[PDB]
Every structure is written in structure tokens, then in C-alpha cells.
Amino acid sequence: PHELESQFILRLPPEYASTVRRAVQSGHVNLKDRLTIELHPDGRHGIVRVDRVPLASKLVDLPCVMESLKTIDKKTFYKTADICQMLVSTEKKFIWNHGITLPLKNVRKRRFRKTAKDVEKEVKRLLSTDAEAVSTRWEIIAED
Amino acid sequence: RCLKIYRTFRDEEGKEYVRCETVRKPAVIDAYVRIRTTKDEEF
Amino acid sequence: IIQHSIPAVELRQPFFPTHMGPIKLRQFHRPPLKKYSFGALSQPGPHSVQPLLKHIKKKAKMREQERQASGGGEMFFMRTPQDLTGKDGDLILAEYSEENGPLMMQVGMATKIKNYYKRKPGKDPGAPDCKYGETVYCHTSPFLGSLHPGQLLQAFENNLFRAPIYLHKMPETDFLIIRTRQGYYIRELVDIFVVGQQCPLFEVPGPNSKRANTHIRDFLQVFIYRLFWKSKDRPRRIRMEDIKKAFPSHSESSIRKRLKLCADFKRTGMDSNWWVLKSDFRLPTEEEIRAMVSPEQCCAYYSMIAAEQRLKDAGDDEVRTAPWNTTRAFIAAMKGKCLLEVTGVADPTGCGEGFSYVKIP
Amino acid sequence: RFSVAEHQERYKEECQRIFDLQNKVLSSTEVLSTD
């Protein structure tokens, strides 16, 4: 079978980003030894090791949706993957408010329309507790 | 208006403890009540 | 005019899913980073990323050899799923301004970049040249506004929408990591477009619509035909629980309705508990199966069911912002049926920027 | 009491104004302060 590839964006500190960029544009396999990525079983924490120097990482959710688009002639572009996550290196904490481009900054707060009436999972847990019970008493309350 | 639920359960050996739990999240409220009102009509 | 990849026009199941559950509809076009169970990355520990610049230039040189061996014209290359990897070709990124657009491309589908250039009054030097896309001189603005004299605007153009894009340079810190089961791979990116508010060219159907139920029935029929084509048995035969694995929300009466014509159930003897193909039934050819369902209809259906989930989770203003209403409003405004209030609640920004596509008389 | 050119022209101009505001904001390379 075929499994859709999973692309994400890696953001590094600027000096380490310059060393990683120089090693990528060089093209040797020396970069392979220099750059490693260890993702912790939390799922939202990691180490990126540049030149064997550990950096602390967080996998965050991006507010917009990006899409990688490949081309052969630079006139027709084929969508290859959807990017929604970034492993910035240096829950509410795992949500990034800004977008990658310069015009998109504070997009989640300002350029996103918010419509409102985790919570569903909590309601399911409450229903399960009511089922495991015997007698349930309920009242919409006031200030108390 | 917040939502408060009283739950009656039996502990190991013999016991009948009652738990009163108050939900102050109006989002949890809406989803909770909507199931009861549905299950009340689901009879 | 838009030619999608052969995995996309054949509706192959990684790229075009048969069924999307609730947790997969909430993560629609935002796929989380899954943990592997088997593979090299499934073992916990540090993992080296691998540069892929010999791979990129080897694949580009190989594709240029293929193109010059075929007479030198423009060629069609995306014939396999392994052509749609990010490991080769010139990648750009495309960011979206809206959170949930009315229409959105699946993986494997093609789009074009058109540079609309309105000439200056009288003499003009020529279109400011651009790295990507082809230039076209637009007297009649494609979008809602009109172009200024001497203004070039790039845009994504396909069958689904048309949307103004804006080229920005990448940040100096961000790279692109393509992870697969075997390891991590790293590219740099240099070009990232920002996609403005989409102008929809395809109408998303409503829930329980006639077009909606027709697409569900035709998608199930196409999947059944492609399972019959994949069968190696000389009387072509399929199993029912393959279809029940693909479409688990379907009642089995509908699946048996699709199998009633073109198949019959063998209970005893050979081919027992199989749905063999009827001997008088001619299984449709590949181009007929492609003419049954289009990929843009699948994208419109996915937009409808994702918006159904978001509305369902959030308990009339929201209903107006549903893509069936907004796509109907915009396409009706483009024929000149009706006008749209450009300031309203269907505004995907939530501020004065951007349009709202809801009908006004 | 126009019921024809007034409504049509008003809609058209609001459309050009929004199109031109969106183009400018999106193509801005100006840095935006974190809020």
C-alpha cells in the first residue's frame, strides 16, 4: 500500500539555522551525522541535536494550513502533502498563534473568525460515571 | 446557571457514598443536558 | 485543462479516503504526526536526518532525459504514487489566510499559477516577469475587484477555486522535514505563497441533497468496480467485508443495492461467500470509471462533511458560513443572479478584511 | 429612490475596496508586533 508522507517544519535558533543551512546546501552525508531528531513519548517534546549540541523542542500546531506543491515545469503544481505542525527549537502551549509568513502574525487572535456555542470527552466521562452509578440528582443552579 | 450532579455508588465490601459534582463550564453543560433531554425522549 | 495525477483521477484510497470519522473530520487537512508501530522510526531514540540534494538533481536530470527522449515537448510525469513525494522536484509552500476554506485540494491534484496583468493605459513596458506561472493579460478582472493599470496579480487557478496568491520569502530559520517510516529527510524552502480569500468555482452540495446522495452512491459504485478490476479470480469475485471496511457508516442494504446489479452472491459450492461478477455484465473500462466520479466532486463532498462536523460540534449565522450556502451565493453572483453583502458574518477574517459570500437581492 | 444603478455601483465599489485592502495587507513585508 501507499502511506501519505508526513511533512512538518523545523524552526531552529538563528546561528544553528545558519549552520544547518550551510550543511544542507553543501550536500554531503556529513550533515546526516551532525543533525539528529529525538521525539519524546509525550509527542509534543523533543531534542534536535545540531553538531551534537542538544536543543529543546516543542511540536506545535499551526493556525493556518500549508500545502507543499511540487512542480516540474513551474507552471502546473501538484499538491504533495499538508503541513500543520512545527518543531520549534531553542494543550494551549502546543498551539502556535502566529503564521509562518510575515503578513500572518497574530492570525489566530485577529484574522480568524471565532464561532462558539476535550469538552465532548469530559461529557462522555460524566455520562460513563452516571451509568456506573445508581441514583443521579440534577438541578440547574444559581449563585452558591 | 451552572450545573450540579449528585452520583450514588457502592464501594468495595459494603458502602453507599454519594458524590455531588458541580460543572461551571457552560460548554460541558450544553452537551451534557442535550443527551439527557434526548435520552428522556429516547424512551 | 487541469490534468491531475493518475493516483488522483483514479481516486486511490490513501489520497481520497472512502470514510472519515469524527476525529478525522475535526483534523481535516491538519493531519497529526502519527507514531509508527513498525519501522526504523518506531524504535525510540535519536534519528539522523538525511540530506536529499543528490536525489533531487538525479531525479531532475532523469526527468529531463525522459523529456528529451520523448521529442522535447512538455511531458506528463505524475503517473505513480511515488512521483508525488516531496523528495524531488521544486517544492513551494502555500499558506492559507482563512481557517477553513470552502474548497481545498486533496493530495495528488494539480493547480496552475496564472499571473493576471492589466496593461497601463496606452504604452506599457510589459508584465513584470515572475518566477512561477504563466502570464495572461486580463481586461476583465477574474476576482471581485478590478486590477489597477500596471498591476500584476498572481493566482492559483484550478477547477475548484481561484484565489489570489502572494509570494513571500521563507523565514531564515525554517526547513522542511519529510518523515517516512524509514527516516527523516530535510529540504530547504525559499518560496512561500500566501493564498487570499478563495473565489469558489465549484458548488459544495448541501447535506442530504440530491447531489450529495448521488455522489455517495457513485463513489461506492466506483470503489466496487475497482475492487472487481483488482480481483485475480477468472470469474471476478469480491468480498462484502472489504466494502464494509471501506464504507463502515453505510447500511449494508445500500451496498447490496449497488451489488445487486453487476454481481450475485454464491452461498454454496465454489466461490462460496463471494460476490461473483455476472457473466453478461461488461465491467466498465478505465475511462468510463473515471467519467463516473471527478476528484473535484470528492473535494466538494469532503468540504460538506467537514463543515457538517464543525457545525454539529458547535451546537443561523454559522449556517450562512457553511460552504454550500457560500458557494451557491458566489456562483450565483458570478452569473449575475444576485448580489452579495461584502460586509457580513460569513467573512472568514472576522474583521473588515475579506468578503462575505451570502446572497442579497 | 434608486433601486438599480445605486445598489449595483455601491456593491461594485465595496468589492474593489475590499479586494485592494486584502491585496495590500497580505503582500505587506512589514513586521507585525506580537500582541
Side-chain angles (χ1 to χ4, degrees):
Chain A
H2 183 271
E3 302 313 329
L4 278 182
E5 52 185 9
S6 176
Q7 319 180 2
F8 60 95
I9 291 280
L10 158 73
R11 161 157 316 167
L12 283 151
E15 37 178 21
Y16 294 112
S18 90
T19 69
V20 172
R21 171 165 318 276
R22 171 193 330 161
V24 161
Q25 294 177 336
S26 159
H28 296 114
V29 285
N30 179 19
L31 161 71
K32 175 170 174 57
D33 335 334
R34 293 160 37 99
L35 185 48
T36 72
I37 291 181
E38 181 162 16
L39 213 66
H40 283 265
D42 202 298
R44 322 289 276 197
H45 280 87
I47 301 185
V48 185
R49 225 173 310 272
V50 172
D51 279 304
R52 279 51 187 276
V53 168
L55 295 171
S57 294
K58 277 191 291 217
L59 186 78
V60 298
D61 280 306
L62 293 176
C64 319
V65 46
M66 282 177 287
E67 45 172 22
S68 302
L69 264 73
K70 79 184 289 191
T71 188
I72 316 297
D73 45 71
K74 286 182 183 43
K75 289 171 159 38
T76 318
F77 292 83
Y78 295 83
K79 182 185 181 165
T80 79
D82 270 296
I83 314 171
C84 55
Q85 266 169 337
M86 195 165 58
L87 189 58
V88 193
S89 301
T90 283
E91 284 296 347
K92 174 207 58 57
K93 192 50 225 61
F94 307 132
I95 264 177
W96 204 253
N97 301 315
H98 330 288
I100 276 191
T101 61
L102 272 188
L104 301 180
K105 189 87 195 294
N106 316 314
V107 216
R108 223 150 196 157
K109 308 320 183 187
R110 185 264 305 196
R111 257 223 170 205
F112 275 173
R113 64 169 296 88
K114 304 167 184 175
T115 60
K117 49 285 179 181
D118 295 2
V119 155
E120 188 174 343
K121 198 180 314 176
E122 291 158 26
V123 166
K124 290 165 177 173
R125 299 169 218 169
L126 291 194
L127 179 52
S128 310
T129 61
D130 296 324
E132 296 153 351
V134 176
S135 177
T136 298
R137 166 60 195 170
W138 134 97
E139 16 193 331
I140 338 178
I141 61 169
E143 186 178 355
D144 189 14
Chain B
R1 291 190 189 177
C2 306
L3 218 284
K4 84 172 162 176
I5 295 295
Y6 291 59
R7 281 146 177 158
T8 303
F9 76 92
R10 180 175 180 177
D11 204 358
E12 295 301 343
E13 300 172 357
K15 197 194 178 187
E16 280 180 4
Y17 189 74
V18 292
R19 314 188 307 258
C20 64
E21 306 188 16
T22 71
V23 160
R24 303 181 179 181
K25 294 180 180 182
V28 175
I29 294 181
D30 288 347
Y32 188 88
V33 171
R34 179 177 183 177
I35 292 190
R36 189 175 68 260
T37 298
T38 300
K39 183 176 180 179
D40 287 347
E41 256 52 74
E42 294 298 305
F43 189 77
Chain C
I1 178 178
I2 307 289
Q3 52 179 177
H4 313 299
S5 44
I6 313 294
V9 299
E10 291 187 356
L11 267 48
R12 288 194 212 175
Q13 303 327 313
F15 318 100
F16 284 78
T18 37
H19 186 242
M20 284 201 285
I23 63 154
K24 208 79 68 183
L25 276 173
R26 294 176 195 130
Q27 312 162 348
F28 185 57
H29 288 319
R30 292 155 168 94
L33 205 73
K34 54 180 267 279
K35 183 179 186 180
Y36 298 119
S37 314
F38 74 106
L41 291 203
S42 47
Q43 283 88 72
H47 295 296
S48 277
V49 314
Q50 324 182 30
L52 38 52
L53 197 40
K54 63 187 181 303
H55 178 92
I56 293 179
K57 76 172 64 174
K58 271 310 277 187
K59 209 64 72 181
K61 175 192 309 165
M62 166 196 301
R63 285 175 180 141
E64 186 57 40
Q65 286 181 355
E66 293 185 3
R67 166 179 279 145
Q68 294 314 296
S70 73
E74 93 99 16
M75 215 176 161
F76 183 76
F77 287 113
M78 326 296 286
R79 296 181 170 156
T80 331
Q82 292 98 39
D83 307 331
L84 285 156
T85 61
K87 305 209 281 174
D88 42 42
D90 204 70
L91 262 67
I92 67 168
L93 255 57
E95 193 148 66
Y96 282 80
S97 292
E98 318 160 334
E99 177 168 22
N100 310 295
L103 279 169
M104 211 89 75
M105 276 200 318
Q106 296 290 122
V107 167
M109 282 180 55
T111 193
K112 287 181 163 285
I113 293 193
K114 298 284 171 63
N115 315 324
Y116 299 103
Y117 176 66
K118 192 162 192 176
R119 321 193 216 251
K120 292 168 196 63
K123 211 36 176 287
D124 91 274
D129 189 68
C130 328
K131 190 180 165 185
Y132 294 109
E134 71 206 79
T135 179
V136 282
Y137 310 103
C138 87
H139 52 303
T140 165
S141 186
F143 328 74
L144 281 190
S146 200
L147 274 191
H148 283 52
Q151 173 188 0
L152 174 138
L153 195 61
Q154 309 207 23
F156 278 163
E157 198 257 347
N158 50 0
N159 295 310
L160 274 183
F161 50 87
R162 183 191 303 117
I165 65 187
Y166 310 99
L167 175 59
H168 282 265
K169 32 178 59 180
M170 274 277 299
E172 299 280 287
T173 54
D174 303 9
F175 307 95
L176 172 82
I177 319 289
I178 311 150
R179 84 192 272 270
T180 52
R181 196 169 295 277
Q182 290 89 28
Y184 295 100
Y185 298 105
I186 173 163
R187 306 191 52 154
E188 62 188 339
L189 262 292
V190 62
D191 303 325
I192 176 166
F193 286 80
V194 195
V195 181
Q197 171 141 8
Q198 317 175 353
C199 304
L201 310 182
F202 205 90
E203 176 199 312
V204 174
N208 269 354
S209 171
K210 189 187 60 189
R211 178 63 246 161
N213 300 327
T214 307
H215 175 263
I216 303 179
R217 152 180 66 219
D218 291 8
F219 198 70
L220 177 50
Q221 194 58 73
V222 162
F223 180 79
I224 282 172
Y225 286 154
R226 294 208 177 276
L227 281 201
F228 266 121
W229 269 116
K230 215 184 285 171
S231 177
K232 306 137 310 310
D233 304 297
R234 289 305 78 250
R236 297 176 163 293
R237 47 188 216 178
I238 59 171
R239 282 220 212 264
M240 162 68 76
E241 40 252 356
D242 284 24
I243 321 178
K244 280 168 56 187
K245 269 192 293 275
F247 301 88
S249 86
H250 269 72
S251 46
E252 320 178 54
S253 318
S254 54
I255 314 172
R256 285 201 281 261
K257 258 188 279 196
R258 304 266 70 79
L259 296 158
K260 169 195 54 186
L261 48 89
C262 86
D264 40 350
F265 192 65
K266 300 298 173 200
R267 288 198 149 87
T268 187
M270 199 59 259
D271 312 282
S272 88
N273 309 148
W274 289 80
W275 285 85
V276 294
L277 190 85
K278 279 167 153 83
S279 300
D280 47 66
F281 182 77
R282 168 197 50 108
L283 210 44
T285 73
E286 167 69 34
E287 198 91 340
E288 301 183 35
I289 299 172
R290 283 182 206 191
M292 276 169 205
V293 192
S294 168
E296 290 91 8
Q297 305 185 14
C298 314
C299 304
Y301 180 72
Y302 293 154
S303 312
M304 181 258 287
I305 58 171
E308 211 192 34
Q309 180 69 192
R310 287 194 293 269
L311 272 160
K312 204 158 313 182
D313 291 353
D316 168 43
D317 310 12
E318 209 164 355
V319 180
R320 294 196 295 275
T321 75
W324 39 98
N325 296 328
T326 75
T327 43
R328 278 177 56 83
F330 191 80
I331 298 170
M334 290 335 271
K335 340 204 206 327
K337 238 193 67 173
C338 58
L339 300 188
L340 317 173
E341 43 166 40
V342 283
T343 172
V345 309
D347 181 275
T349 293
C351 317
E353 306 140 349
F355 311 87
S356 90
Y357 304 140
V358 281
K359 293 187 189 172
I360 216 63
Chain D
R1 90 104 179 262
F2 322 86
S3 78
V4 46
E6 177 87 301
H7 226 194
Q8 173 265 34
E9 144 63 353
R10 288 330 163 81
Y11 148 98
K12 189 284 166 160
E13 54 101 24
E14 204 51 345
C15 285
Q16 182 160 7
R17 191 274 284 213
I18 309 268
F19 158 82
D20 196 13
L21 169 57
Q22 129 173 307
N23 291 19
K24 182 162 46 65
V25 161
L26 290 177
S27 206
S28 85
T29 61
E30 177 207 0
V31 296
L32 277 87
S33 61
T34 302
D35 65 343

